[PDB]
Design a binder for this molecule. Structure first.
Ligand code: 6SK
Length: 93
């Protein structure tokens, strides 16, 4: 994953915007850095992740599961996480 991906400007779709607004998000255009931070905050706030769980996020009965279309995912699979996030936004250029 190149460093530049973090600077990508994005407009989240309604479901993702709903999720972001729960952890402070105020805006309609974000950087991918912001989106990844607010998602991370959402995950740790809802205890969907822990280091004793083999690096897995459990989102089966949660908004995040509906957004991503999976009951769970590994935090090590970075490219797959970007793909899941991209289905819920539109890039700005
Ligand atoms: C899981 C937790 C430790 C709470 C947060 N992790 C730690 C980072 N290594 C990871 C991450 C950072 C940047 C890009 C990616 Cl692809 C993944 C990240 C994160 O910072 N945001 C975010 C969002 C989602 Cl949906 C999944 C995983 C993450």
């Amino acid at each position: 994953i190149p460093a530049s991906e973090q600077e990508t400007l994005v407009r989240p779709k309604p479901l993702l915007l709903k999720l972001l607004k729960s952890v402070g998000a105020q805006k309609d255009t974000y950087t991918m850095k912001e989106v990844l931070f607010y998602l991370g905050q959402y995950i740790m706030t809802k205890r969907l992740y822990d280091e004793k769980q083999q690096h897995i996020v459990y989102c089966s009965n949660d908004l995040l599961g509906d957004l991503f279309g999976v009951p769970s995912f590994s935090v090590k699979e970075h490219r797959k996480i970007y793909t899941m996030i991209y289905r819920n936004l539109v890039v700005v250029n």
